[PDB]
Amino acid sequence: HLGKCNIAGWILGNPECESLSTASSWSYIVETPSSDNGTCYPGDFIDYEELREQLSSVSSFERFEIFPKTSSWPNHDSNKGVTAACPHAGAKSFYKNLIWL
Amino acid sequence: DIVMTQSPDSLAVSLGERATINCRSSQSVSSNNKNFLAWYQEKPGQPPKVLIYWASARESGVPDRFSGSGSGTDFTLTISGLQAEDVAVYYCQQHYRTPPTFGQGTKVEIK
Amino acid sequence: GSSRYSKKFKPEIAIRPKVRDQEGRMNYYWTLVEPGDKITFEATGNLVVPRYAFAMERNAGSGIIISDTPVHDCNTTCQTPKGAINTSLPFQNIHPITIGK
Amino acid sequence: GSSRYSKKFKPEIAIRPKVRDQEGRMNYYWTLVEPGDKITFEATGNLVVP
Amino acid sequence: HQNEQGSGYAADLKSTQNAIDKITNKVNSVIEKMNTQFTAVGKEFNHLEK
Amino acid sequence: QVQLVQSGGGVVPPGRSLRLSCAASGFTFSTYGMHWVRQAPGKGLEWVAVISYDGNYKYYADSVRGRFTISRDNSKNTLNLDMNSLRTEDTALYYCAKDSQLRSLLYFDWLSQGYFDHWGQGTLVTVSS
Ligand SMILES: *[C@@H]1O[C@H](CO)[C@@H](O)[C@H](O)[C@H]1NC(C)=O
Ligand SMILES: *[C@@H]1O[C@H](CO)[C@@H](O)[C@H](O)[C@H]1NC(C)=O
Numbered sequence: 001h002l003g004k005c006n007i008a009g010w011i012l013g014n015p016e017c018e019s020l021s022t023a024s025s026w027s028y029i030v031e032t033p034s035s036d037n038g039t040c041y042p043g044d045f046i047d048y049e050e051l052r053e054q055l056s057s058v059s060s061f062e063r064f065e066i067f068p069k070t071s072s073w074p075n076h077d078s079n080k081g082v083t084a085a086c087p088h089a090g091a092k093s094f095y096k097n098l099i100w101l
Numbered sequence: 102d103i104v105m106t107q108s109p110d111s112l113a114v115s116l117g118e119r120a121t122i123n124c125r126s127s128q129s130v131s132s133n134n135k136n137f138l139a140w141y142q143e144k145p146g147q148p149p150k151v152l153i154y155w156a157s158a159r160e161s162g163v164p165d166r167f168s169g170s171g172s173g174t175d176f177t178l179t180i181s182g183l184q185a186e187d188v189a190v191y192y193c194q195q196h197y198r199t200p201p202t203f204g205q206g207t208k209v210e211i212k
Numbered sequence: 213g214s215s216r217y218s219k220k221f222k223p224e225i226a227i228r229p230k231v232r233d234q235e236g237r238m239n240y241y242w243t244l245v246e247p248g249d250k251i252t253f254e255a256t257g258n259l260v261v262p263r264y265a266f267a268m269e270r271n272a273g274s275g276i277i278i279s280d281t282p283v284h285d286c287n288t289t290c291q292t293p294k295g296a297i298n299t300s301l302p303f304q305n306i307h308p309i310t311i312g313k
Numbered sequence: 314g315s316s317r318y319s320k321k322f323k324p325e326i327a328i329r330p331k332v333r334d335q336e337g338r339m340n341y342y343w344t345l346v347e348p349g350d351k352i353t354f355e356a357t358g359n360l361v362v363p
Numbered sequence: 364h365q366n367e368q369g370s371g372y373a374a375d376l377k378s379t380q381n382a383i384d385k386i387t388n389k390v391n392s393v394i395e396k397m398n399t400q401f402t403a404v405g406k407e408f409n410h411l412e413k
Numbered sequence: 414q415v416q417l418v419q420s421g422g423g424v425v426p427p428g429r430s431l432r433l434s435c436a437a438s439g440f441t442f443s444t445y446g447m448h449w450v451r452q453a454p455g456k457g458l459e460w461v462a463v464i465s466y467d468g469n470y471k472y473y474a475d476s477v478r479g480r481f482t483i484s485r486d487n488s489k490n491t492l493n494l495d496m497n498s499l500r501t502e503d504t505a506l507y508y509c510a511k512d513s514q515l516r517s518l519l520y521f522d523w524l525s526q527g528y529f530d531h532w533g534q535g536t537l538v539t540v541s542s
Contacts, residue, residue: 001283007276012240013264028291028311028403031278042231043238044319049407051242056403057274062267069263085234097264101257102475133381139528141458148508148532149458155528192458196526199472199519203458224321228314229351237319275403298487300443302397309405317410345410380525387518394516 001030007052008038008045013096015040015088025059040086040095069099076101102200103127105193107207115212120180122207124193129174132197138176140169141192141203149192153178185211213252217243223258275311289313316350324359414439417509417533419492426542427499435492435509435533442490446512446519448529449483449494451505461507462494463526465519472522477503496538504540509533 002010005017007029016037029052039045069078081100082092094100105126114120130137136156143149151160153169156176169178178191188211193204221239228237238260245251253261279293290297292307299313322342329337339361346352354362364373419435435447449461462473462483471483482495492509513527 008240011242011266028274029276030283031276032280033278034280039240040232041236041238042228042234042316043240045240047242049409052276052407053273054244054270055268056276057271058268059271060267060269063264064267066262066265083234085232094260097262098260099263101259101261132377137525141529148535150532151529154513194528196528198523199463199521199526200474201460201526203460206457226314226321227353227355228319229316229353231316237314272401273403274401275405276407277405298443300394300441302394302399311403311405313399313401374521376523379521383518383520383524387514387516390518391516 002035003032004035004037006031006035006038007055008048009035009040011051011055012039012098014038015086015093015096018096022061022063024061026057026061028056037086041083042085073101103130103195103198103202105195105202105204107191107193107204109207110205111208111210113210113212114183116185117182120183120209122178122191124171124176124178124204126174126193126195130195130197131173136171136176137195137197138171139194139196140178141194142189143192144189149190152191180209183209213250213254214243214245215249216246221259275309277309277311314355315344315346315352317347318344318352322356322359415511415531417511417531419507419509419533419536422507422536422538424539424541425499427501427540429499431496431499431538433494433496433507433536433538435494437490437492437509437511440511443487444516446514446517446527447485447492448510448512448526449481450508450510450529450532452508452535453502453505463512463519464492466516470519472519499540501540503538505538506535507533507538508535 002017002020005014005020009017010020014037045051067073078099078101081094083094083100084092087093103126105124107122107124109122112120112122124138138156139154140152140156141149142152152163152167153159156169156171159165159167166181166184167178168181169176171177176193180187188209191207191209194201221241228235243251253259277291277293281294286296288296289299289312290304291311293309294307297304297306297310304310325338325340332338341361344352354360364370415437416439417435417437419433421433422431425431437447444466446463446465448463450458451461452458459476460474461477462471462481464471464483464485468485468487473479473481473483480496480498482497484493484495485491486493494507510529510532513530517527519526
């Protein structure tokens with residue numbers, strides 16, 4: 001279930017969407033007509049519907065950190081990357097699953 | 102309703118031989134070339150499982166040594182090579198009228 | 213880059229209409245990586261980089277339901293957006309959009 | 314640009330085969346604009362305006 | 364039937380038993396012969412692919 | 414895999430209600446009829462009651478007619494047996510069974526039931542003071 005989230009907002013990890021309890025597997029995806037918490041930073045999600053269709057049914061689902069935030073960018077900073085497109089409790093905040101560089 | 106009797110009751114034979122029990126019904130049960138009789142077998146502490154349905158077939162998982170036949174009002178259950186793990190109680194059951202009636206039952210055991 | 217996906221994203225600069233009181237724009241992408249494969253991210257700017265990704269094995273394909281109905285525990289085999297169906301009879305007139313047998 | 318469409322356009326400087334007495338092909342582009350939006354054509358060349 | 368010694372209804376057995384058997388086979392054939400596999404008839408499309 | 418488990422039994426003095434539930438899973442429950450059958454201690458089996466797939470039509474034996482109430486909830490795949498007006502003879506071991514004729518129709522009080530495919534594990538009910 002998504003509630004106020006949609007598929008884009010949960011795959012990208014919206015500030016309002018981190019509260020959902022992920023599961024190891026699911027059959028289908030529940031949305032609501034009042035769900036508009038998708039792409040915070042305005043833009044075009046290329047192949048969005050394909051991502052929605054591919055992600056419908058899985059049997060094992062393990063979110064993991066490919067590049068750790070605190071160690072994989074020695075030459076770059078990542079704490080200055082925030083946006084006012086959608087805030088978390090009134091503070092500028094980018095997605096949980098992406099990092100501004 | 103309908104009542105039936107299994108004439109051998111508490112018969113005892115040893116391993117390997119043949120055990121025959123009959124089943125005589127009060128009235129005819131078979132219709133349109135089909136046998137409406139089933140056999141049941143229960144071990145101490147276990148629910149009575151189905152052994153032979155429609156008096157000729159066999160429930161998957163039942164050993165091939167269990168076979169039965171019969172027509173009209175007389176039916177027979179035959180045991181080919183009794184095993185010591187088959188000490189149990191056998192039942193008749195005509196599912197032809199809304200009161201299905203089980204027979205009084207017979208016991209098979211070691212000699 | 214990967215074993216099957218390869219595309220160079222040239223950044224573009226322009227003045228866009230204000231959406232969510234933000235002037236800029238951002239195109240989001242996704243791709244699949246096979247087991248034993250390599251994905252590559254090489255850039256000099258204008259690139260947001262993954263922090264957390266996801267792992268899965270897809271189980272055939274299911275659908276996505278949009279509705280305003282609460283969720284409880286069941287064992288059903290048809291799922292309309294407005295309820296479930298016995299599926300013990302071969303014709304139903306609840307909703308064209310269904311998922312399951 | 315708009316609330317939905319956003320993509321930069323690049324010239325196509327090359328000598329095409331002659332067709333309809335003319336050398337060169339120009340591409341036309343169509344987009345909706347939802348109510349309460351703003352479509353904001355902005356170019357310094359090669360812009361066939363609406 | 365009514366005669367000098369008694370009366371009342373007396374339903375026949377075999378004919379209507381065969382009738383029940385054939386009708387239950389009829390409804391079983393009508394219901395169960397339609398087999399259906401898993402499917403997802405709900406599809407989603409964007410604005411550029413009407 | 415067909416499974417039939419039932420509980421709720423025990424000891425009861427005559428004259429108070431007792432309710433039994435035989436939950437079922439692993440098979441298509443709503444398309445099959447169910448039965449009630451009991452094992453009097455030291456005696457043979459005898460039939461109790463039957464309910465069809467739609468639950469409209471129910472039947473009972475000649476010994477417990479007017480005292481039992483067989484019921485069913487297909488939404489939970491749960492068979493139920495309301496059981497009132499006890500006497501000492503009613504002590505037995507109760508099993509829930511499944512009929513063999515798929516989607517069988519029971520419209521009168523003499524029809525041909527199917528044979529019993531699978532049985533419950535059995536729960537003890539007894540009548541004592
Ligand atoms: C979420 O959607 C609601 C819809 O009422 C909107 O008002 C709100 O700004 C959105 N919040 C975020 C963080 O996207
Ligand atoms: C014959 O059966 C009828 C019902 O058809 C019954 O009333 C009567 O007692 C029986 N008579 C004899 C002589 O058997």
